[PDB]
Amino acid sequence: AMSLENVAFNVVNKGHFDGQQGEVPVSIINNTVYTKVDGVDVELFENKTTLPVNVAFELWAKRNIKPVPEVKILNNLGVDIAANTVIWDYKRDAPAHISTIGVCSMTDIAKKPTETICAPLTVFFDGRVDGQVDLFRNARNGVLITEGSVKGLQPSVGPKQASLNGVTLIGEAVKTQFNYYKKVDGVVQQLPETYFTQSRNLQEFKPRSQMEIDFLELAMDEFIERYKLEGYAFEHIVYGDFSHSQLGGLHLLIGLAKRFKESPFELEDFIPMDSTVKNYFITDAQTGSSKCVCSVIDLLLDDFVEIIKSQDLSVVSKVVKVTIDYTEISFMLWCKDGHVETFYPKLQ
Amino acid sequence: AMSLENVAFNVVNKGHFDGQQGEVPVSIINNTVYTKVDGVDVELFENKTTLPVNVAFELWAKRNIKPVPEVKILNNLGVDIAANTVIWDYKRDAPAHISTIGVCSMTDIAKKPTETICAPLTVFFDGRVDGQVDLFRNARNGVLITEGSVKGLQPSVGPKQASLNGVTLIGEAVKTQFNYYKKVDGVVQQLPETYFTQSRNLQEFKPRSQMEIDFLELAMDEFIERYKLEGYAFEHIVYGDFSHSQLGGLHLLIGLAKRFKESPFELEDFIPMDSTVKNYFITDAQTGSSKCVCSVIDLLLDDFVEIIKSQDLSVVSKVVKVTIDYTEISFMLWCKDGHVETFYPKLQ
Amino acid sequence: AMSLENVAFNVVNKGHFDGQQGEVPVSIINNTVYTKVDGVDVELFENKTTLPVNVAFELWAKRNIKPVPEVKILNNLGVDIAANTVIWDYKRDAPAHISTIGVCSMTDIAKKPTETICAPLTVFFDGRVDGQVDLFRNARNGVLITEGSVKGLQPSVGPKQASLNGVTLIGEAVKTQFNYYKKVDGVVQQLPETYFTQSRNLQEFKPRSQMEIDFLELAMDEFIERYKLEGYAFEHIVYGDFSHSQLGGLHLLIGLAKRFKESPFELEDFIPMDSTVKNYFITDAQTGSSKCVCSVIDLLLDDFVEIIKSQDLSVVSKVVKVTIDYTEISFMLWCKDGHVETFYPKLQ
Amino acid sequence: AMSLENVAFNVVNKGHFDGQQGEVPVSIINNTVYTKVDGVDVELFENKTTLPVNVAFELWAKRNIKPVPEVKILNNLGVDIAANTVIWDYKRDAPAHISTIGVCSMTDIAKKPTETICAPLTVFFDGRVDGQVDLFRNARNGVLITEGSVKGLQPSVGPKQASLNGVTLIGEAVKTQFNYYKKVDGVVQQLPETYFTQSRNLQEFKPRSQMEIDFLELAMDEFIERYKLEGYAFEHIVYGDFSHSQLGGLHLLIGLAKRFKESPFELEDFIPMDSTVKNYFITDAQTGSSKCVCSVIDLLLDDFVEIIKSQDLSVVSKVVKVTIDYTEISFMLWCKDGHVETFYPKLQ
Amino acid sequence: AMSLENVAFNVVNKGHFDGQQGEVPVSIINNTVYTKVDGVDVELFENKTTLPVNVAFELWAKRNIKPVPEVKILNNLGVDIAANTVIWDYKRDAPAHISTIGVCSMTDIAKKPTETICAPLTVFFDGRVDGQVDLFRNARNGVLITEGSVKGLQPSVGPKQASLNGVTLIGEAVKTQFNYYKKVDGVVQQLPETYFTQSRNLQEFKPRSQMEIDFLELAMDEFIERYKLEGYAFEHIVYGDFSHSQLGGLHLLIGLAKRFKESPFELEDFIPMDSTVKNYFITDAQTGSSKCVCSVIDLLLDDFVEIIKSQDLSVVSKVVKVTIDYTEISFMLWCKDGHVETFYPKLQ
Ligand SMILES: NC(=O)NCc1ccco1
Ligand SMILES: NC(=O)NCc1ccco1
Ligand SMILES: NC(=O)NCc1ccco1
Ligand SMILES: NC(=O)NCc1ccco1
Ligand SMILES: NC(=O)NCc1ccco1
């Protein structure tokens, strides 16, 4: 007995949609949902989506409140739709997927993922929900996450972190590391060997290794000395060059975090969404050095160091494909006289 | 079990809210309510009110579909709120009253009119609904309509016409003439002697008397000759003078209807609402004669002749108070040498 | 003492802005202005402009309520702004000009047209307002309209019709024929010889000559016989050809009006504005003959016969420039063997 | 002479409405008020209310800029409307009350609180404004605040803090502690003996006692040791349990503030308004422990300690009613073997 | 080949408009521009302007990404429009100017600044763009900025800081100090001798002199002692008096920054725009001292000290005009017995 008033009742009483019965009076004004709390209207939801306000309200209330894969992972895996849940994209304030399966009558393409409409779409299955491993086995296309072993299915250990209600974290009270499985045209596809982005912030960047502790504490020339990084252009790539009008390098989040403690800078996120590689229009406030498209990736410094050190430095310029977050990230390697000039996530 | 989806279900299946169970999928976009009909959205309601779109949708769906008093009558009687119904104002595309009683949880001030909040307000009671005559008897303030006699209560025979779903008509299959009763502070009132406006349209004006048939068929000087209207300025007041830049007179709907058959004109209804007297910015398309505020009243021509004939034509200018539709309508009488110069609903 | 509440007071009490003092309570919701009339909101204005709702409300309330030149005439004369008035464009539900002079503080570029900002702009002056003939004499650029003679200034007799509150009419109670004067860079211009469009409607088309009476009453081959129009393609140009999938000709409003009495058709006005030549996507409902861009001009049939009769019918195709409404209208003349094939307002 | 342009003039020149004369040109676009400052529009107000944009602009400009009671206090006291002022709810970006008394013609139910419409409503009176103590004496329903003694009226000393322009503070340059008085149906009602919430923030939480200094500085088991809090479940209730998927306890703001220094967490305020007890959907970022409805109250730790220590621990579960902010806050006490299991503001 | 889809392509691929060819599918919803990134909409721009959403999107994408003069400087110089660029006002989230020159067809008054429409307007020229010095020489009105010498043109050294993408900074990798030139009616106007505001923030205020280091570190009476500021009311003017209900003085940003470290306060920026002198409704959170209009100027403390020390203290009250940011800032000097009582940017 689905209704706007019942969704609002659940938001008010349960903090989210929890299948409870009841209704609260709602008023909809423009793109905002309100509820009368003792005579005055209290805002429950502000629609930031391209969907109708009441439709987005229900989808947001029916969002998965369990730790789920980050949208970038789901996207790199080709996920089109989720099975009997809504993955909320907190970075875009919108549902990660256009349609639903057994969630909301306005966005539903099917009630069960076994319906023919779902066969050509890569449905996301959560092995933590009863019957979803079997639904994945019978689904023509899908992505499955589990907490343990699935008999006969070869696992792909995913990232340590998951998104819980918009918070990217490595779980201690909850499991955030999942086993990943994919199916393309009824066939279980072998997921590639891959690195994972660390999903850290600039404001609260914490080192996750001794090399990262040394990078943040030590001076530039003495960190490079310790880790044998001479001839690998870390001064340009990771530390960044703020001497000319165009900002040089600065493509690893760890290098932005180090700069951040000394002096502030503006990162204009002109395509605000979750992605393995992010693009920013960066303006350094101390020097005035700036760059319209500064591609930034949050790799564990040891992982980036391993990627660059295992590259041949004999060619002037080549494309270096690295599998990060299950996707092939093309990088652009530029060399001269046996030393790296620059190495950056390739702008397409 | 009130819900947006259930109201929409009733609109879709029953043409209005009919207490039926069921839900249809709704999407709200801006000020418009839509329903999915086999994949595509179909518009159900366009909010023209100052209330939230979903709230106005429910009030409109819960409108009285029986012949009810015209909003102008209810307004002249001081009606603030209706009992367990919504009087839809089709001229304003909005509810006639701000609040409701046992209709919609967002607009309800009470569920039953017997609650203390309703005592100071003039509640509208419909004797055609079971128990409303008694509720009126125990209500401090109220206006009652009945089809027949109420024991002990002296009636006021209201207008012949009522509004059925926005159509003002004199019923043949339905009763449209009601008995009116009013109570102020527990005291049953003696409703004054009143004339009634005929609520006719310009496009479909029909004469309701022999004098009105003669006015529409006969020429100006020969109608006035027949009805001894010499010296009462009907040439100015009713027929209208289109010879000067400012349109002279034309204050009776019958005179606008007669002009309408010969040549067209524009009536700009700058305050669109139901009222005993209406104001228009009239532009005559044939001559170009115009007037910013031309007050127009639809009185039965015999009634308007009785009012003008029962006046003292000896003062230059005076205010002539006439009870029309239960309200006191001030008119402005202008005379010279014992003859009327002009007589029009007072602009104030 | 300009205010939203005062403008609304004038709209409510005077039918338009009339410099009266007073205020009424206003509420603005989306693009609509409302006023409280005894507890409920009554719509006063719906903004159809690209200006802010309160700004457009004031400009509309301050519109010229006297018969004024049609927007197409003002436009063909290069009028940029009006002096101390607002010419309301009733076809676009918007002000005819972007800025004002001494009208509204939000749109005003100057209070008086004598200010330097107005010198490069063609200010519209109305000789019917005290002091505007003199203001025109001292204005560098301007267009003047008068009812009678201006000493020393040679006049151009404008069209018979003017727009009074959105109604295009030939005045009987008011003067609608003006004398036109134009000045470019201080030099009084000699306005060219021009024809005028008749500004008629399809629903209420009235013949303004004996040739037009004969065209509407007589049959095709017998009207052409009477007026010696053999070889001038009137069967195609004026009457229209509805035998093929593409509608042939039908470029003169008189021919659309004649078709209209027999069978209906849809005219999609895809660029809704006032112009000498209008373009419509016409679909004939009887035959299904249609045309995406059917240019239509309302010329007096005698004027259109004079234009076609005074052409050289010896070249296959040429551009025929005709001055209509003071503007140069290009027509496309197509001939074969000394007879007209087609003649239509040039699509460019 | 109230107007949109005059309100805007006062906002621009006086920082708020100050009864000054003058007008500034305003443009209204969507839900935003703008003023032309040297040719370009500058935003003055963004409507976050369910009221029309110009109406909310005036109410916000006419907000009380003196230290006033917090909305939660006014709400717990049953305040419906304020007398000749607007209490701005800075937490909801909206007026605390639906209607006004002698403030704005669009929201006014009366000009003076002595009018009959105000008798059934609890009007808020400010003894700091001349004549408001007397108005309270003659008001059937009301809440009064004073800075000192009112002859014959028994006072209720309120909270130390008040809201000054959105800032909750304990005044030093201004008085923030008021005397409270209430009237229900013409009878002065004895306000209850009550505790008060401390109205602190998480970001800037400061201890207001030695017990609170000890709680924030000392370790868990050594604070409990010092204050004899063994067997009272402070480890669960105040400190919080982040070991399981559902976050245990954490119902006192002081415990959230202590957690905040060590590790961050997200508090989703799904009903954003001022209330004695607040509900949050909390997600701990370090552990991933979370709770959909975590009720949180900011009591002085000594006050909470006194509340819990004065409870009988013989029953498995009972409702414990505590008067906080003049309202009866129901708590749920759970015990086992003579020790407290949990104690939390009861979810209704 | 300008288009919405091409602007969006440039925003997506180049971080801003860069003249590149290509199109990305766009959807416009309300006041927001979106792009489909793998099936879901990603927000590219939120219109905060009074211009149409697609128009403001193009202007923002076409904003000057080089260090440009701060809007307050341009405004004090009388700049109306920029030549072949858009100066984005990041404080108002809108273009600094109403119209453009060769930027966007919807806002363009001309394609080149040499067109007659531009002659009466003060066009902004950037000597760093080829041909703009010459365009300034031929422009009737204009403001020019250069990086070096212009033959024959007497320079005015401007402020050290410029705005680069919204960031006010003193350039190290880029030049931010420009030479300024002005022309009024074809005549090069001598720019006045002036002080400059330091354009600092409260959150990140850094001293730019030894006097400013001493002010922030030293106590009140010992700073005044060192700098001989006795009898100059710095205790009131710069430090601020928080003892009475109305906040005393506090008109220099350095004094707000010093207060900020000790205790927080709210600055309501009721006219949010760039100006030499800013007005705030300040509420001190510790004391509750407040002021509706507290004018604040960010002058280098040495510059303010020099301004006040060079004033005659013989008159009770006088207007002190100081040229700051090329504009005459009127200050109000109040004296008694040879000592300063108060000195503040004069409220007009
Ligand atoms: N990342 C990873 O461990 N891939 C191995 C795999 C096995 C089956 C699917 O992927
Ligand atoms: N309020 C008032 O004056 N009412 C008049 C009345 C009371 C009873 C009958 O009429
Ligand atoms: N700008 C221009 O070329 N104007 C033509 C003109 C000037 C005077 C009379 O005509
Ligand atoms: N909180 C408190 O002090 N109550 C006592 C009281 C006296 C009159 C009304 O309340
Ligand atoms: N500020 C300044 O240096 N003014 C001198 C000047 C010379 C020409 C124009 O201004």
UniProtKB/Swiss-Prot annotation, chains A, B, C, D, E:
Residues 206-345 form the NendoU domain. It comes from the Viruses. It is found in: Host cytoplasm, Host perinuclear region. Likely affects Nsp15 binding to RNA. Residues 3-63 form the Nsp15 N-terminal oligomerization domain. Changing H251A: Complete loss of NSP15 endonuclease activity. Residues 64-189 form the AV-Nsp11N/CoV-Nsp15M domain. Changing H236A: Complete loss of NSP15 endonuclease activity. Uracil binds at K291, C292, V293, C294, S295, T342, F343, Y344, P345, K346. The record marks K291 as: Transition state stabilizer. The active site is at H236, H251, K291. It catalyses: uridylyl-uridylyl-ribonucleotide-RNA = a 3'-end uridylyl-2',3'-cyclophospho-uridine-RNA + a 5'-end dephospho-ribonucleoside-RNA. The record marks S295 as: Uracil recognition site. Its cofactor is Mn(2+). Plays a role in viral transcription/replication and prevents the simultaneous activation of host cell dsRNA sensors, such as MDA5/IFIH1, OAS, and PKR. Acts by degrading the 5'-polyuridines generated during replication of the poly(A) region of viral genomic and subgenomic RNAs. Catalyzes a two-step reaction in which a 2'3'-cyclic phosphate (2'3'-cP) is first generated by 2'-O transesterification, which is then hydrolyzed to a 3'-phosphate (3'-P). If not degraded, poly(U) RNA would hybridize with poly(A) RNA tails and activate host dsRNA sensors. Homohexamer. This is Uridylate-specific endoribonuclease nsp15. It comes from Severe acute respiratory syndrome coronavirus 2 (2019-nCoV). The gene is rep.
